[PDB]
Design an enzyme around this catalytic site. Sequence first.
Site, PDB file in Angstrom:
ATOM      1  N   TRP A 312       0.905  -1.226   0.074  1.00 13.81           N
ATOM      2  CA  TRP A 312      -0.032  -0.146  -0.204  1.00 13.81           C
ATOM      3  C   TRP A 312       0.838   1.307   0.029  1.00 13.81           C
ATOM      4  CZ3 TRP A 312      -1.179  -3.675   4.267  1.00 13.81           C
ATOM      5  CH2 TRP A 312      -2.156  -4.795   3.866  1.00 13.81           C
ATOM      6  N   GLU A 426       2.748 -13.624  18.065  1.00 12.81           N
ATOM      7  CA  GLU A 426       2.814 -14.885  17.315  1.00 12.81           C
ATOM      8  C   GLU A 426       3.290 -14.376  15.763  1.00 12.81           C
ATOM      9  OE1 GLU A 426       0.435 -12.320  16.618  1.00 12.81           O
ATOM     10  OE2 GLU A 426      -0.212 -13.894  14.943  1.00 12.81           O
ATOM     11  N   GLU A 429       2.457 -11.179  14.234  1.00 14.00           N
ATOM     12  CA  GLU A 429       2.953 -10.171  14.954  1.00 14.00           C
ATOM     13  C   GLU A 429       2.061  -9.228  15.418  1.00 14.00           C
ATOM     14  OE1 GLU A 429       4.877  -8.392  11.268  1.00 14.00           O
ATOM     15  OE2 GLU A 429       6.811  -8.566  12.463  1.00 14.00           O
TER      16      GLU A 429
END
Length: 1019
Positions: A312, A426, A429
Amino acid sequence: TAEPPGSPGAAATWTKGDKEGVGTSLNPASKVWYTLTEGTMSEVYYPHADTPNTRELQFAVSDGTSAQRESEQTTRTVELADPKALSYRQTTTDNAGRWRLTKTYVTDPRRSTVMLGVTFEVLDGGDYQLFVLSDPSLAGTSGGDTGSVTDGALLASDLADAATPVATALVSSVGFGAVANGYVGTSDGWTDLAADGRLDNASATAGPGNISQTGQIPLAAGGKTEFSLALGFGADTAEALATAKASLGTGYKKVSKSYTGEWKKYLNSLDAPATSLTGALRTQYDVSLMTVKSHEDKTFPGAFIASLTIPWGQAASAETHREGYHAVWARDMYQSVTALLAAGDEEAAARGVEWLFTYQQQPDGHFPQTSRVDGTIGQNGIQLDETAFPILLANQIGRTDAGFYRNELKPAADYLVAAGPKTPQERWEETGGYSTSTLASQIAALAAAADIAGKNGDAGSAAVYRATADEWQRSTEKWMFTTNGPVGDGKYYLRISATGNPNDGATRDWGNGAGVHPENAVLDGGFLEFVRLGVKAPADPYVADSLAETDASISQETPGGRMWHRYTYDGYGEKADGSPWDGTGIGRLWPLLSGERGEYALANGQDALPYLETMHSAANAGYMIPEQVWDRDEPTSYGHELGRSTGSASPLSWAMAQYVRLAAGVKAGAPVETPQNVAARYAAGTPLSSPELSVTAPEALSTADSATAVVRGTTNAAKVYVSVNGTATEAPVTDGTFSLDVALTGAKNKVTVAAVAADGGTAVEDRTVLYYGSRIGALSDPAGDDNGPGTYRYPTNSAYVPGAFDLTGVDVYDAGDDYAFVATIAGEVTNPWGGQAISHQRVNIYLGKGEGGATPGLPGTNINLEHAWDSVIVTDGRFDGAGVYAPDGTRTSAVSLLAVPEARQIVTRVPKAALGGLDPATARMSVAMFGNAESGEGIGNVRPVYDGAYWEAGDPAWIKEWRFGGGAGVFDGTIPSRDTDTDDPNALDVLVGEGQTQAAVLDWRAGSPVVVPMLGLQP
Ligand SMILES: [Ca+2]
Ligand SMILES: [Ca+2]
Ligand SMILES: [Ca+2]
Ligand SMILES: [Ca+2]
Ligand SMILES: [Ca+2]
Ligand SMILES: [Ca+2]
């Protein structure tokens, strides 16, 4: 100097993450990486793979009256120019079919130059002008650039960063006609040409700021003209121009051949892929392989960035340095080398392992969330899988030499043992707790570390690692497999649990705008990592029931095959209207998850070819596999297509890698990266016995009395190892029992007890031991005693948590140069009002030798001590009112206060010298707990106690809200005591000795001021 109008240039952004193709030479001499976006050349990286320098380079063509950007032509194609090299060809055709532009990209393998082979064909009566539009963003910033002209070349630079100076040179094999530099949005080439199809701005210089360069290409007489452009890079302008010219000097054809030849030779030298890979799947393999390879840095071999893009980016400002995905993630790198390893590139993996432990590993042993290619830390989150994967990389590659084990591997494994099974973050993130995905890598990493430790003769660390991994492995279902989930049969592995009780329905906000949902409702394919890493058998039953619900919750069938979202309610993706993610949105499909499901299928003997087919259906004509593909039939106002790449990273090295790794698995008949030594222990047949293990001492949490702690208990194991903070020492087992005085190495000691049976099975127990030094002596005190003579009340305000003024004990330790006076309370140890360690407690410890008789304590105290005192220790982390004080109020020394809430302790470090030769080992002392207060609230910083009924009334309101009650007196703002009656002691509780009681000692009605007993420390 006359600058063209527009300074300093418009605010700029980067480009969409969706790349049509990327490329770099195999040769490490060429420090350039190019990317293509929508018919133009987007970001080009240099000198390291983590630094973008370009926004857009495309052509504009005019007739003299009007001009057009090739990015405006709805008719343009992209295709790989060679099936065995990362060379792409873009073709732009005038919407009216009057002209056609053909661009083929390549890089000079010998120097940092990107080359473009161009052919311009006029299909009209002719008479057109051709212009190159190059808009840089040197050194990772759109601003700070300076454009100039020299010897017929376009130059640009930004040397604002001494460690990363960047300059370029755009040179035309046929030279340029008109040349110009300007400020984007005002005097740049396009803004100019759009105006009147003419290049009115002739300024040969512009900047610093956001500039762009424009060069007219002299066209040959006739329909078409063939030429080439060279974009050279260097630490400075002269270097850049020289590199570019050297490239043109060799020529496009020659350079193109060399570049294409290295790649062809590279592929041809690696393992031959499965014969079952049809043409398209084979080309996908070849391109994925090279692309992964191209993510390795050329200055720090072994360092792999996640992706040469900025997801993006069209919405990401370029004014300030940005990380995007062009940074090194241990996880993504693990996926990358594991793929090159599957394809047969061993050296890349060796460099990789070496780079990880040398440049990215932190002194404490763990790996940072992200870093630059030189190891410079980027993001600082703690992802335990990023510490486990590098261990698994070394395990796979055999990097197990004694030196590397002691200084590299052990510290990483020790960190994992110290971190416990819960990961603060995890793989996505975002959150922490017991993670299926991360715990799988933790177990495999420690199981592997155990074999490596053993192979190197370190039996203690081996037992610790194996016992720990074994325990987590057998706890996988207990911690994360829910049985009452609101989907399907309600039985499946959830994504992550905060408590380790998958049925408690605990909730949490899942970020990205997903809101709050119970952990029971969030499904995630991360559990597939269990079989992939050999932590569970391929046919494990628990992994099996997770399938149906997981598929129902997050899977979906696209025209290319089945795909999966990461997890339920995932919001990391475009918004409902198609606009880029900006902190919130909706997660889309991740093609790499299909590759993952495919490895699970393959491990179970199924055909994985269809998963490769699905992964390839997500690629564009350039064969770029993205991080995400759109999942809706509706193309919003943006041009989103179902099954096609979104605005995020593409190519994602990881997705590219997952395609190659699965392909290799297909050829071998089983996932090729699964750690054999780990699967042999957990995924094979026959299980192992778990020895009985009972540690009777110490308790879960305790404070030692010396530099050693007694660790003992029972077991039927053959051997026992007691390890503290990574230091293991064997405990000899005698007739099922053991007992060891182990050395304490730190203030906080994580003690792991591993029991190993004769057949290899293990049991483990963890204990935490706090250490302050040799214990001089102690004093105890009952809980629920915080009511003074028995009638005092805490001020109603919330801040005054229950038990805050309830001492339960006092322990004094010989701490080298200091004495550690540790006070333990029943209530939680808070510190809201922002103070040193504590805010509310004000404890006094009067030290003496039991001489004389009744002696007054400190001013606002309202109490006497049984005997005289030489000094008093004030524990008040408020207003710098702590330290050791002489009876006249003089502070003879400063003290340090430390809070240990886990133990409900309040530590006061007192330098020995502070107690002028007064040994606490044989001294008498009185201990009293008061509430701290501001001078204007009472004398000596002590919060006074007032009449019970008066307090109960609550008139005014602050009395029953911020003052003690149940004593005697009312507020009086005229005197320093602020109390109209100081007969009642302001102590909420004190310590007393045998035969006496707090109710009698604090009974001020039977005597005032009360006399607090002077006690002695019991060894
Ligand atoms: Ca710049
Ligand atoms: Ca610019
Ligand atoms: Ca290291
Ligand atoms: Ca008490
Ligand atoms: Ca009073
Ligand atoms: Ca007491």
